[PDB]
Amino acid sequence: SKITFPKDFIWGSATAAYQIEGAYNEDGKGESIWDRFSHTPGNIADGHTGDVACDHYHRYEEDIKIMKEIGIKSYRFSISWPRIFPEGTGKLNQKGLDFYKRLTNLLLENGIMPAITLYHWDLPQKLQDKGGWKNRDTTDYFTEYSEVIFKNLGDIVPIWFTHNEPGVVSLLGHFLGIHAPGIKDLRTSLEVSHNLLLSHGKAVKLFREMNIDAQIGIALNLSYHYPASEKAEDIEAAELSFSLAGRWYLDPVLKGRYPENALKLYKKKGIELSFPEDDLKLISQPIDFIAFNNYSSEFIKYDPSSESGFSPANSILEKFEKTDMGWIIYPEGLYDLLMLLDRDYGKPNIVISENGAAFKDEIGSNGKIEDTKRIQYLKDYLTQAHRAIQDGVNLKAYYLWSLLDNFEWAYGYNKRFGIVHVNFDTLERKIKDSGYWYKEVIKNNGF
C-alpha cells in the first residue's frame, strides 16, 4: 500500500555537462582535462569519447520538452568552466555564458527549478598545465569563475552545489589515474582533496558576500560501509574505510576537521599535511544542506596484507543481486546512510543529489524500453528513503541519475543510467518505462 513523501518534497533528475553536452570544440570552448583524457587510447571503454555525447548543447529544447512531460520539479545540471573561461582565467566567453543563461531561463519558463553544480570534473586543461588542483591558485580561479556565474544566475537558481564528488576526482583522478587527469601519486591526491575543499569554502564565502537568495551545498559520493562481521577488527576496518572515503570530506565541511584515524593511516605511509588552520575554517563555512550521490553499499574486512589495512569482503558481496556495474543492490543501505548523516552531523538538511542504476536496456519490437529492473531498484531504494523520513531525517529532495543515457566516464556509453534512452548514432530520445513510472511517482508524490 501507498507511500507518500512530505508535501514540499522536490522530485528531480540530474546530468553533468561533459556527459551529455558534446560540442566539445565549439563557440571558443577551451579544452578540459576530460577532453584530453578521452582522446587517449586505453583510458575509456571501446575508445568512446564525449566529443558529441547526447549533443545536448544543440538539443536542450527537445530535452526540456521531455522533462516537462515527465514532470520533474528540479533539473540538476553542471556548468562547463572551460566554456565560460576557456583558459580557466582571463577573458570571458560570452557565447558559453549565454548558453547557460538561456538554458536556465527556458527551465524557469517551463516551471522547472534549476539546480546548478559549479564543478563536475571538467577543469580547463590550461590550468592543468600549471598543476591543476595541486596548485592552490586554482582555488582562486574557481572563485572568479563562480563569481561570474553567481552574478548572472544567483538569485533565480534556488539550489547550488559547489562540487560533485571531490573524493572521486581525488582518488580515481590523481591516485589510481583511471580518471582525468590520470595522475598516480598518493600525496598529490591529498593536496588535491584539500584544494577542492578549499575552493568549496571560498565559493560558499563568496555566495554569502553576494547575499545570493538561494541554498548552497556540496554533493559528496557516500556509501554505507558495513563490517564483514561483529569482530572488533572488522568494525574498525569499516570505520577506517568510511573515514578515508566519506569522513575525509564530511568532517572538514561539517565540523572543521579531518578524521583522525585517516590521518593516522597516511602518517604510517609517510605523509603528514600542513594545512593553514584558517583553511579548515574556510572549508567549514555553514551550508544550507549536505548532498550525496549514492548507488550501493560496501562490505569491508580487516586485511593486514592490504596497503590500507582493509579490503572488500568478496564472500559477502557474492550473494546479492548486482547491477550492470557489478555493484550490489541493497536498499537498506540508503536508510542506514541517511540515519548516519542525521545522527553524526546534527540533523542537517539532506539532498540525495544522485541515485539510479544501470541495467542492459533493449528497445523491443514494440519501440519501448521495459526496464523493470530499474523500476524495482528505484521502488526499493525510494522505500528506504521514505522510511528514513518517517524516522525523522530531514531529506528534502531526490535527484534521479540520470535524465539521459550518457558518457559514463571510463565505461564510455556501455552503461546506461537514463530514464530516457539515447541512441548515440541518431541522437534520438525515447522515454523508458522507468521514466513513465517516475512521471506517475511525481504526480502522486509517491507510490
Q: At what angle do helices 372-390 and 332-344 cross, to 10 degrees?
A: 30
Output the furthest CA–CA distance in the chain (Å, rounded): 62
Which CA distances in Å does 349 have to 240, 295, 384, 427? 25, 20, 17, 38
Q: Catalogue all structural domains in the chain, each as residue range(s) with its CATH number.
A: 10-444 (3.20.20.80)
From CA 75, how far away is CA 364, in angstroms rounded?
29
396 touches 10 (CB < 8 A): yes
- 3 state SS of 442: helix
Phi and psi dihedrals of 327, rounded to 5? -85, 140
Q: Give me the DSSP letters along 183-249.
A: ---HHHHHHHHHHHHHHHHHHHHHHHHTT-SSEEEEEEE---EEESSSSHHHHHHHHHHHIIIIIHH
From CA 383, how far away is CA 4, in angstroms rounded?
10
From CA 196, how far away is CA 189, in angstroms rounded?
10
324 touches 415 (CB < 8 A): yes
Amino acid at position 346, single letter: G
Question: Grid coordinates in use for 365?
Answer: 519490437
Exposure letters 351-383 (e unless 16+ CB within 10 A, then b): bbbbbbbbbebeeeeeeebebebbbbbbebbbb
Of 290, 378, 375, 297, the closest CA to residue 332 belongs to: 297
Of 289, 9, 19, 294, the closest CA to residue 160 belongs to: 289
From CA 421, how far away is CA 371, in angstroms rounded?
11
Method: X-ray
Peptide bond into 259 cis (omega under 30): no
- 3 state SS of 302: strand
Phi and psi dihedrals of 105, rounded to 5? -60, -45
Can you give the C-alpha Rg of the chain in angstroms?
A: 21
**Residues that are catalytic:** 165, 354
From CA 434, how far away is CA 70, in angstroms rounded?
10
From CA 98, how far away is CA 110, in angstroms rounded?
18
Residue length of the chain: 447
From CA 352, how far away is CA 347, in angstroms rounded?
15
The resolution in Å comes to 2.4
CA 6, 353, 357, 314 torsion-angle sign: negative
HSE-CB at 380 with a 13 A cutoff on CA atoms is 16
Between the two ends of the chain, the Cα-to-Cα distance in Å is 8
Place of cell 589515474: 177
